[PDB]
Amino acid sequence: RRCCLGWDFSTQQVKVVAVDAELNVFYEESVHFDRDLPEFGTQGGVHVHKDGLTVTSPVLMWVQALDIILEKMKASGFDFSQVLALSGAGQQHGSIYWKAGAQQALTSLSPDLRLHQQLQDCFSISDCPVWMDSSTTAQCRQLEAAVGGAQALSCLTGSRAYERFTGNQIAKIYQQNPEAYSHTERISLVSSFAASLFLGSYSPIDYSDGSGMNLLQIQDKVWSQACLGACAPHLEEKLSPPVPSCSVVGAISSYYVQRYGFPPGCKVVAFTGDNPASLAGMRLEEGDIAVSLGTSDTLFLWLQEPMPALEGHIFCNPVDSQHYMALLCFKNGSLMREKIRNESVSRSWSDFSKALQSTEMGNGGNLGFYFDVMEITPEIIGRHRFNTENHKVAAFPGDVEVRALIEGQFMAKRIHAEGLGYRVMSKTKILATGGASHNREILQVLADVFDAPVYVIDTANSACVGSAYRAFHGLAGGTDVPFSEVVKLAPNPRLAATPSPGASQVYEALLPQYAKLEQRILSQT
């Protein structure tokens, strides 16, 4: 059974899957940080500092989690001689600061010792900033001022300045800890840090995860000298040139061959961010979108011609380096759906579904926005309801409320997607995942709004699986063959809904009206 490994260096755990050549996930293992490395004192895999804004993880905890999981794999009888290649994902934005001399330690790893034991003194920063950090507002404003504004920075890098984005974190470390910065020979993302551990030498940063830093020029795929200089000095030398995501970055270190029995020819395919890896795992193509429904809703888009904005994040595409992808994040997700259920349909998902079945597409022209917490896409708060004459109203009947919520949430996803350059195409498939993807009536609204078929997919391990698929791509020809052709053989996700007759006519007229009301609410703020 020949296989590839797909890794995920996530916030709360390190996870791995082994996928055979039939693209069967036949093995999965994980190390949970709070539970299995409780000595670091993390909660949810991180440390929220006294200020309530700084959020970090110890780099040596991630190294040790790799040692533990390889030993857990070996203890279970995993046959490492069967591994042809591996790739992985890292929680985006988080950064690792390697101390001067660390590459000599990586290239001289002894198979008689664990990684953590040998890399103990290799980090100039022990507490790494992660994606949950919101402590760099001053640096964000400085970077936007240095490059001509928020929109200029988005045009250049796919995003305006966000506190968690790596360049702003690097700037804070340079300003507050210049000694540690002066002792840093290399800076990695979590993804490229993990790839470096497998190579036994520094891995380059890939174009896709490299797009989550406010540093890479996404169009020309070179570092922006203006962004680099506005963040910290000598920064280019520390990052090294970025590479296409579908690059073989080297063979696995002899460390792993000797300690665990990996074959010497095992290839390391460049690692990427967890959201880019999930896009690969979900097998999105040109014209596709994925809706991940949860506490936060996340929209994944394929983009040929992106239009960066003051919202959303455009990244270089991990499975087609000449094109792009985007993420749009919505704070009012599953808690907002549960609240309307509890308020209007007796705390019952069945009655929620019956409300959707008993109301027509377009909801008689009744439209609603439901933001009990400040929304990020767009920046609005409150509940706002409008009747068919576009007059504000205080409330709706119960069933009308349920449809206004669901239809409005999906119309917002289509409008904001199209603002970034997305367009529905004849080939378009919509992939739905998360709790609400288990409701047929919710997915019917989604199919109706986009006028395209909706498929349900399980994504508990999408970043791991996507990483294993990318590794197989690397083996099946790399850039000589399309990613989509390599993983076509994986069973197709199940069709949940197709647009009802007349859906096109209803939402062609209602979508611009909903967009107009959104701008009306934004103008009143």
Swiss-Prot record:
Pfam families: FGGY_C, FGGY_N. GO terms for biological process: carbohydrate metabolic process; D-glucuronate catabolic process to D-xylulose 5-phosphate; D-xylose metabolic process; generation of precursor metabolites and energy; xylulose catabolic process; xylulose metabolic process. Its EC number is 2.7.1.17. ATP binds at residues 349, 435-436, 439. CDD domains: ASKHA_NBD_FGGY_SpXK-like. It catalyses: D-xylulose + ATP = D-xylulose 5-phosphate + ADP + H(+). GO terms for cellular component: cytosol. Keywords: ATP-binding, Carbohydrate metabolism, Kinase, Nucleotide-binding, Transferase, Xylose metabolism. It comes from the Eukaryota. Substrate binds at residues 93, 164, 274-275. One of its GO terms (molecular function) is D-xylulokinase activity. The keyword Kinase applies. Monomer. Belongs to the FGGY kinase family. Phosphorylates D-xylulose to produce D-xylulose 5-phosphate, a molecule that may play an important role in the regulation of glucose metabolism and lipogenesis. This is Xylulose kinase. The lineage of its organism: Eukaryota, Metazoa, Chordata, Craniata, Vertebrata. The gene is XYLB.
